[PDB]
Amino acid sequence: NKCDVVVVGGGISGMAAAKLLHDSGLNVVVLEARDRVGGRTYTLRNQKVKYVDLGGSYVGPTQNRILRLAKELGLETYKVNEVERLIHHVKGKSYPFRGPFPPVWNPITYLDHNNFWRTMDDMGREIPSDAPWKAPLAEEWDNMTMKELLDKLCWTESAKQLATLFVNLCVTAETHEVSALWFLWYVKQCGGTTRIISTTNGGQERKFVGGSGQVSERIMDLLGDRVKLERPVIYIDQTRENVLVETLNHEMYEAKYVISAIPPTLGMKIHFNPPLPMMRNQMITRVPLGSVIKCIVYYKEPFWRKKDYCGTMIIDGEEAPVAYTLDDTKPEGNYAAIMGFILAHKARKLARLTKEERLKKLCELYAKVLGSLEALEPVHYEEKNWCEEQYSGGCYTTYFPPGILTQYGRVLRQPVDRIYFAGTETATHWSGYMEGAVEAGERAAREILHAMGKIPEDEIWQSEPESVDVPAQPITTTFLERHLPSVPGLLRLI
Amino acid sequence: NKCDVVVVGGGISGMAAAKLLHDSGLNVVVLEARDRVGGRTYTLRNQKVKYVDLGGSYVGPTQNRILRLAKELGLETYKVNEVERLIHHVKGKSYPFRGPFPPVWNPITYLDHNNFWRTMDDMGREIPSDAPWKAPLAEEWDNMTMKELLDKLCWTESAKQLATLFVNLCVTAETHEVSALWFLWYVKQCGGTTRIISTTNGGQERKFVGGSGQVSERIMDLLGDRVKLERPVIYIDQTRENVLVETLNHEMYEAKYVISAIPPTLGMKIHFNPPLPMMRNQMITRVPLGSVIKCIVYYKEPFWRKKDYCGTMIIDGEEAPVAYTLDDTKPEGNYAAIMGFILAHKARKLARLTKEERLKKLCELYAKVLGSLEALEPVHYEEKNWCEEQYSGGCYTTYFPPGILTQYGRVLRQPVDRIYFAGTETATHWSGYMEGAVEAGERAAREILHAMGKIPEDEIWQSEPESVDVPAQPITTTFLERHLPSVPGLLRLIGLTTI
Ligand SMILES: *[C]C1=C([C])[C]=C2C(=[C]1)N([C][C]([O])[C]([O])[C]([O])[C]OP([O])(=O)OP([O])(=O)O[C][C]1O[C](N3[C]=NC4=C3N=[C]N=C4[N])[C]([O])[C]1[O])C1=NC(=O)[N]C(=O)C1=N2/[C]=[C]/[C][N][C]1[C][C]C2=C1[C]=[C][C]=[C]2
Ligand SMILES: *[C]C1=C([C])[C]=C2C(=[C]1)N([C][C]([O])[C]([O])[C]([O])[C]OP([O])(=O)OP([O])(=O)O[C][C]1O[C](N3[C]=NC4=C3N=[C]N=C4[N])[C]([O])[C]1[O])C1=NC(=O)[N]C(=O)C1=N2/[C]=[C]/[C][N][C]1[C][C]C2=C1[C]=[C][C]=[C]2
């Protein structure tokens, strides 16, 4: 019945907020729609796989908040395999390489590729992390899709294809679906192109031993009976002295404040009294989540390593069901596996098939790319289509279509009376990730602490000390990378 | 408790569906979230205005379903005033004209303008009304915003400006927000550019005497206690023999079938068991409604008529709060009024101001455009911002951003077990309008009748006889309009003679 704060949503953001408030001495309740915690993270356990992450999984350098929270909960990380060569598969052919970027040999194509990545970071430097709508050219860039930007920037089809794959993989949406301003903000707030795409020294460096689902599970252990499972919130009433929160199974909760720790659009599932202010009312109908199926194919042995392949594949073309893979073998070297993402329109297209039909397509692709008949003999298969989830709406995160970020963006984390907004979408650093979920939950919890007169205003936003276990190398450029001309630049010099 | 069909939503679509089913002999219940029926139609009544439509209002030739329904209910129409001259206000200057289109004098600009409108209709002919995703170039056009299409087509700023205003007015959204394929479908399914923009012989020809809100009100009168007000639906359960429908105030309703007669995205407010199929689950997060404030300024007399202006203004420019007006005077000639729309980004921008501040801005604009000091002395003002409505989401209707219609469009009116889908967004003719609401509601009702084995399959979609009261002139083009070249076409003809 009665408490200090109701937290709506038991994913990482909601759990991190609840933990902070509980540690501060307040009475908290977490209302969770599902029969489990974790939300967009989900660790499946069975004898065949031991454990596998079917949602959010990877962590890396500069993600100091998730690393600190996980460590405090007794969790450890291990390194994703990147010892051997990566593969770039293009026009039906495999090209092995080392380092973060697939090499380019044609001098014109080289100039075009270099300029694209450089320009993305160049543009990003003009976009404030905490206010992308304040970029000098905000409106111009927001009224443009990424597809339009790519058409303007890329003078070769080779650069445009890779850039397109990059967009699809980053935000699980088509280039024509997303705002240019929003996408450039998204990459920038993760630390730039190199940081976001890299395994070693980047976002895909590490996973948690035992799965990321343990973060939410272990906080639930700490909170005990304060977490209420199968309690979808349907109604929030702010007309009286105390806030009233009603669930689908007819329970009523009373609190001084509420944290909404759900994806922005999922706010539509709640009936508000009084009605939301105009801007938020419309915003929450304008912000969809992407489309993805996460697939893991298991093998007797990590056979690709014997051919000096690490298991990373970058696979171009419409025919390929999966555009990107990583080695998903356990740190001990057993439960050999390849993880792949089926992205955007392909997720929608291939969802019509059966599980067995999808397994076959993936194995035939991997056999081709790795040049190995062993890829055709899987021992097990696990997959998850996030598009079908009523209480997620998709994965990995919310994207903004053209025009939306400049018009509605400032309302994302603006409080509505006694409701405060968490969730990874409201973060300013690694928004879209588990790291962003921790930032947003803890920040929202502190906003309430300030509202109660318990902490000063300057303590709402808190910096995080660097992890000693996962240190960050700085991102470097070469002299030639900085000063080599673009294709139109070279033509101008001619 | 128990009935044959639960209808969710008491707007025109839901009421038309309920009436059809009730007339067929079935037990129906309508569950309506608000304390009133009508939805996106709302007629306000007070002594100062007598009556005024604050939502949906205009009807015209080819909208035969709404006209027939209204006539059966005892309603009558009258003609919107278009006796005197229209005004095109551009670059701070007013240019009076006659006919549907503002004239263009510059020969290059003339070619550009002619080609734009022609091309819109040309492209539309390739788009099936009942399946726009089947257009031969569906993907190409869907992966493009209207802004991109305009940039490619319009060789003069003059044509691009007017085309932009046209998009804003049609669908209450910016050119960069909407898919080109969707917008071209939208215009085509209303009968084309001329039909959609015209007063005389078009969509804005007429209004209902006493207001359009009477359509829903009078059906409620016929249904009696079957309409339940202040019953927002929160939960639909389809796991058992009968469908269970739960409301916010904890009432339970049991039925054989459900019609969902709400805007597609408002389906998000309902929790489903079992969960919706994947495609619909994602679709309903991808389909927002537009942004608009409808404003009516009242005067002692229709003074614009004395200057030979009918009251129609097409107003270009960023500074102008209102881009389009019509005479809203009563047919008797009293309660003189100008109706104007504040569109898209301007609706969001000017909502921050007070009512008094907005009134002032409109009057100063009208004084400028009409060249009349009298515009500065209003006697009354009414307005409605539709962006603030929890149970509408916006107005006039749902738009589709780039990429959505080809990927999710086929799921719009696909039944989910025993739930069938009405609402103007699922119509194939005048979708977005009151006409489309009638078509969709009656079609959804007949889908259920077929499911019950009461009618054959070929009776689900029913054609409508033309109104005798509101006849439709055909849309004509001149010889020159059809065969005059575009700007790039003329340049090509110059490149060949000089070779
Ligand atoms: C899905 C996914 C996948 C598949 C993958 C991934 C992901 C995902 N990610 C993301 C994450 O996960 C996120 O961010 C998080 O998790 C979020 O959190 P939050 O904020 O908390 O949210 P959520 O979870 O959702 O929660 C919520 C909750 O709530 C609830 N509800 C609802 N509604 C309601 C409720 N309750 C009550 N009532 C009501 N009404 C629900 O149920 C829930 O629970 C990620 N992340 C990270 O970090 N990592 C990773 O890994 C991930 N993943 C991904 C990634 C990818 N990557 C890739 C590779 C290569 C590359 C890339 C990118 C870029 C570049 C390169
Ligand atoms: C808003 C508006 C305005 C301002 C204006 C206009 C309009 C609108 N429009 C449109 C109409 O109105 C529509 O379409 C209709 O109405 C629709 O119907 P429906 O489908 O039925 O839907 P609604 O109404 O929305 O209903 C629904 C219902 O449901 C309910 N709910 C929700 N949720 C829920 C519920 N219940 C239970 N539960 C739950 N959960 C609600 O409440 C409701 O009731 C129009 N239309 C026509 O026809 N006409 C007109 O006039 C109109 N308007 C407009 C127009 C404009 N125009 C312009 C001028 C010039 C030009 C233009 C365009 C183009 C060209 C030129």
Distances (CA, A) of B498 to A115, B492, B493, B495: 40, 10, 9, 6
Judge: A271–B176 Cβ closer than 8 Å, yes or no: no
3-state secondary structure of A195: helix
Residue A484, domain member (yes or no): no
Distance from CA of residue A405 to its chain's centroid? 18
Among residues B197, B230, B255, the one where a domain terminates is B197
Which of A176, A284, A291 to probe by mutation at the B interface, max B CB count within 10 Å? A176
Among candidate residues A197, A227, A246, the one where a domain is terminated: A197
Closest by CA position to B258, among listed B245, B272, B277, B249: B245
| Residue found under tokens 């539309």 | B124
Kindly give the distance from the C-alpha atom of residue A437 to the centroid of ligand 1, in angstroms, as a whole number. 8
- Quick one: B202 and B251 in the same domain? no
Other CB atoms within 10 Å distance of the CB of residue B221: 11
The amino acid that residue B352 corresponds to is: R
Are B269 and A271 an interchain contact pair (Cβ–Cβ within 8 Å)? yes
Contact present, A291 and A343 (Cβ < 8 Å): yes
B316: its two tokens:
């270009």
Tokens 């259920």 appear where? Answer: B448
- CA within 13 Å, CB half, B298: 16
Q: Rounded to an integer, what distance in angstroms lies between the CA atom of residue A145 and that of residue B59? A: 36
Q: Measured between beta carbons, which residues in chain B are less than 8 angstroms from residue A389?
A: 275, 281
Encoded tokens for B279 = 């495609």
Integer CA distances (angstroms), B429 to A403, B119, B130, B263, in order: 29, 21, 9, 17
The residue assigned the tokens 């009373």 is A254
Residue among A459, A20, A382, A429 nearest A190 (CA): A429
Between the two ends of chain B, the Cα-to-Cα distance in Å is: 82
Q: State whether residue A101 is helix, strand or coil.
A: coil
Structure tokens at A146: 């990424």
Query: Are residues A202 and A101 part of one domain?
Result: yes
Three-state secondary structure readout of B252-318: EEEECEEEECCCHHHHHHCEEECCCCHHHHHHCCCCCECCEEEEEEECCCCHHHHHCEEEEEEECCC
Please give the interface size between A and B, counted as residue pairs whose CB atoms are below 8 Å apart.
Answer: 124
Q: Tokens in use for A57?
A: 């999984």
Residue by residue, DSSP assigns A339-381 as: EEEEETHHHHHHTTS-HHHHHHHHHHHHHHHHT-GGGG--SEE
Would B366 be classed as within a structural domain?
A: yes
Q: What whole-number distance in Å separates Cα of residue B434 and Cα of residue B441?
A: 11
How far is the CA of B179 from the CAs of B4, B132, B146, B164, B323, in angstroms? 39, 12, 6, 14, 22
Query: Between β-strands A309-315 and A85-90, what pairing exists: parallel, antiparallel or unpaired?
Result: parallel
Would residue B482 count as lying in a domain? no
Please tell me whether residue A162 adopts helix, strand or coil conformation.
helix
Give residues (CB < 6 A) around ligand 1.
A 8-14, 31-34, 39-41, 55-58, 169-170, 196-197, 204, 232-233, 261-263, 266, 269-270, 292, 294, 324, 386, 391-392, 395-397, 423-424, 432-435, 437
Exposed e or buried b per residue across B225-263, where buried means at least 16 C-beta atoms within 10 angstroms of its C-beta: eebbeebbbbbbbbeeeebbbbbbeeeebbbbbbbbbbb
- Quick count: other Cβ atoms within 10 Å of Cβ A63? 28
Q: What is the DSSP string of A427-485?
A: -SSSTTSHHHHHHHHHHHHHHHHHHTTSS-GGGSS---PPPSSS--PPP---HHHHH--
DSSP-derived 3-state class of residue A302: coil
Asked, for residue B485, whether it belongs to a domain, the answer is: no
CATH code of residue A193: 1.10.405.10
Nearest to A344 by CA among A312, A370, A320: A320
The CA distance from B351 to A230, in Å, is 39
**Residue of A57, A197, A326 with the most ligand 1 atoms within 8 Å of its CB, for mutation:** A57
**Interchain contact, B248 vs A235, CB within 8 Å:** yes
Strand partners, B380: B298
- In DSSP terms, A293 is beta-bridged to A342, A385
Q: What is the dihedral of CA A118, A122, A123, A125, to 10 degrees?
A: 140
- CA nearest A139 in B: which residue? B176
Amino acid in position A245:
V
Spatial CB neighbours of A366, under 8 Å, sequence gap ≥ 6: A297, A313, A325, A338, A372, A375
Nearest to A439 by CA among A59, A25, A69, A185: A69
A264 and A320 both lie in a single domain:
no
The tokens of A99 are what?
């380092």
Amino acid letter, B173? A
Helices B434-451 and B12-23: angle between axes, nearest 10 degrees: 40
Both A168 and A292 in a single domain? no
Classify A489 as helix, strand or coil: helix
Judge if A383 and A292 occupy the same domain.
Answer: yes
A197: buried, middle or exposed (CB in 10 Å: 19+, 13-18, 0-12)?
A: buried
Task: Tell me if B405 is assigned to some domain.
Answer: yes
Q: How far is the C-alpha of A470 from the C-alpha of A452, rounded, in Å?
A: 36
- Ligand 2 and B411: CB distance under 6 A: no
Determine phi and psi for B422, rounding to 5 degrees: -110, -150
In the reported structure, the alpha carbon of residue A63 is separated from the centroid of ligand 1 by a whole-number distance in angstroms of 15
Task: Give a yes or no: residue A483 inside a domain.
Answer: no
Q: Which of B356, B362, B353 is nearest to B296 (CA)?
A: B362
Instruction: Please say whether the beta carbons of A116 and A154 come within 8 A.
Output: yes
Residue A336 shares a structural domain with residue A350:
yes
Beta bridge partners of A88: A95, A314
A447 contact partners, CB below 8 Å, separation of at least 6:
A415, A420, A460
Rounded CA-CA distance A235/A247 in Å is 7
Nearest CA among B152, B457, B495, B206 for reference residue B331: B206
Give yes or no: residues A297 and A190 share one domain. no
Host domain of residue B418: 1-39+61-76+209-287+401-461
Per the CB < 8 A criterion, the answer to whether A473 and A61 are in contact is yes
Count the Cβ atoms, other than its own, within 10 Å of residue A117.
20
Q: How many CA atoms lie within 13 A of B134 on its CB side?
A: 6
Q: What is the spatial distance between Cα A226 and Cα A253, in angstroms, rounded to a whole number?
A: 12
Q: Provide the b/e sequence for A225-257 (b: ≥16 CB within 10 Å).
A: eebbeebbbbbbbbeeeebbbbbbeeeebbbbb
Name the strand (E) or helix (H) holding A393.
Answer: none
CA distances from residue B137 to B118, B125, B127, B226, B399 in whole angstroms, order as listed: 18, 12, 9, 47, 20
A302 near A276, Cβ under 8 Å?
no
Tell me: do B280 and B414 sit in the same domain. yes
Beta-bridge partners for A53: A43
Q: Which residues contact B313 (CB under 8 A, 6 or more apart)?
A: B86, B87, B89, B322, B324, B325, B366, B369, B370
Stretch (H or E) spanning A90: strand A85-90
Amino acid at B377: E
Question: A278 lies in a domain?
Answer: yes
Cα dihedral: A314, A188, A404, B271 (round 10): 60
Residues contacting residue B72 through CB under 8 Å, at least 6 positions apart: none
Specify the number of domains making up chain B: 3
Residues A277, A161, single domain; the answer is no
Which residues are within 8 A (CB) of A377 and not within 5 positions of it... i.e. 6 or more apart?
Answer: A299, A300
Query: What was the structure determination method?
Result: X-ray
Vertex A394 angle, CA A390 and A400, to 5°: 120
Q: How far apart are CA B422 and CA A285, in angstroms?
A: 20
Q: Are residues A169 and A82 in the same domain?
A: no
Residues of chain A positioned with their CB less than 8 A from the CB of B278: 351, 385, 387-388
Task: Tell me: cis bond preceding A264? Omega within 30 of 0 counts.
Answer: no
3-state secondary structure labels for all residues of chain B? CECCEEEECCEHHHHHHHHHHHHCCCCEEEECCCCCCECCCCEECCCCCCCEECCCCEECCCCHHHHHHHHHCCCCEEECCCCCEEEEEECCEEEEECCCCCCCCCHHHHHHHHHHHHHHHHHHCCCCCCCHHHCCCHHHHHCCEHHHHHHHHCCCHHHHHHHHHHHHHHHCCCCCCCEHHHHHHHHHCCCCHHHHHCCCCCCCCEEECCCCHHHHHHHHHHHHHHEECCCCEEEEECCCCCEEEEECCCCEEEECEEEECCCHHHHHHCEEECCCCHHHHHHCCCCCECCEEEEEEECCCCHHHHHCEEEEEEECCCCCCCCEEEECCCCCCCCCEEEEEEECHHHHHHCCCCHHHHHHHHHHHHHHHHCCHHHHCCCEEEEEEHHHCCCCCCCCCECCCCCHHHHHHHHCCCCECCEEECCHHHCCCCCCCHHHHHHHHHHHHHHHHHHCCCCCHHHCCCCCCCCCCCCCCCCCCCHHHHHCCCHHHHHHHHHHHCC
> CA torsion angle for B403, B409, B411, B413 (degrees, to 10)?
150
CA distance B352 to A72: 46
Residues A204 and A326 in one domain: yes
Q: Which among A341, A312, A7, A337 has a CA at the least distance from the CA of A169?
A: A341
**Are B441 and B12 contacting, i.e. CB atoms less than 8 angstroms apart?**
yes
Residue nearest to atom 29 of ligand 1 (CA): A9
Distance between CA A141 and CA A176 in Å, rounded?
13
Q: How far is CA A244 from CA A452, B303, B362, in A?
A: 18, 53, 41
Q: Are A439 and A413 in contact (CB under 8 A)?
A: no
Instruction: Assign residue A203 the CATH number of its domain.
Output: 3.90.660.10
CA distance A395 to A409: 20
- What is the Cα–Cα distance from A306 to B181, expressed in whole angstroms? 51
Decide whether any atom of ligand 2 lies within 6 Å of the B17 Cβ.
Answer: no
Cα–Cα distance measured from residue A492 to residue B259, given in angstroms and rounded to the nearest whole number: 63
Listed residues A144, A169, A197: the one ending a domain: A197
**How far apart, in whole angstroms, are the C-alpha atoms of residue B132 and residue B137?**
10
Distance from CA of B277 to the nearest CA of A (A): 7
B407 contacts A402? CB cut-off 8 A: no
Contacts of A271 in chain B (CB under 8 A): 232, 234, 248, 269, 390
Query: Where is chain B discontinuous (C–N over 2.5 Å), named by the preceding residue?
Result: none
Identify the residue among A285, A287, A289, A391 best suited for mutation to test binding to B, counting B beta carbons within 10 A and taking the highest.
A285
How distant, in Å, are the alpha carbons of A122, A165, B283 from that of A185? 11, 18, 25
Closest CA–CA distance from residue B190 to any residue of chain A (Å)? 26
Under DSSP, is residue A179 helix (H, G, I), strand (E, B) or coil?
Answer: strand
Provide the H-helix boundaries in A285-354. Answer: 345-350
Task: Report the C-alpha gap between B306 and B378 in whole angstroms.
Answer: 17
Hey, are the CB atoms on B268 and A271 less than 8 Å from each other? no
Please give the order of strands across the beta sheet that includes B252-255. B252-255, B243-247, B233-237, B271-273
Calculate the CA A136 to chain-centre distance.
27
Q: Which residues contact A187 (CB under 8 A, 6 or more apart)?
A: A120, A121, A124, A170, A193, A196
Q: Residues near A146 by Cβ (< 8 Å), separated by ≥ 6?
A: A167, A175, A176, A178, A179, A180, A183
Residue B370, in any domain of the structure: yes
Same domain for B175 and B53 = no
Instruction: Please count the other Cβ atoms lying within 10 Å of the Cβ belonging to residue A469.
Output: 11
DSSP notation for A217-260: HHHHHHHGGGEESS--EEEEE-SSSSEEEEETTS-EEEESEEEE
Q: Which residue's structure tokens are 């081709």?
A: A368
* C-alpha to C-alpha distance for B487 and B491, rounded to whole angstroms: 6
Kindly provide the resolution of this structure in angstroms, with one decimal: 2.1
Q: Whole-angstrom Cα distance, residue B331 to residue B85?
A: 18
Q: Residue B245 and residue B266: Cα distance in Å, rounded?
A: 16
* CA distance between the termini of chain A: 75
Instruction: Identify whether the C-beta of residue B224 lies closer than 8 Å to the C-beta of residue B237.
Output: no
- Under DSSP, the state recorded for A275 is P
Using a 10 angstrom Cβ sphere, with 0-12 exposed, 13-18 middle and 19 or more buried, the burial of residue B154 is buried
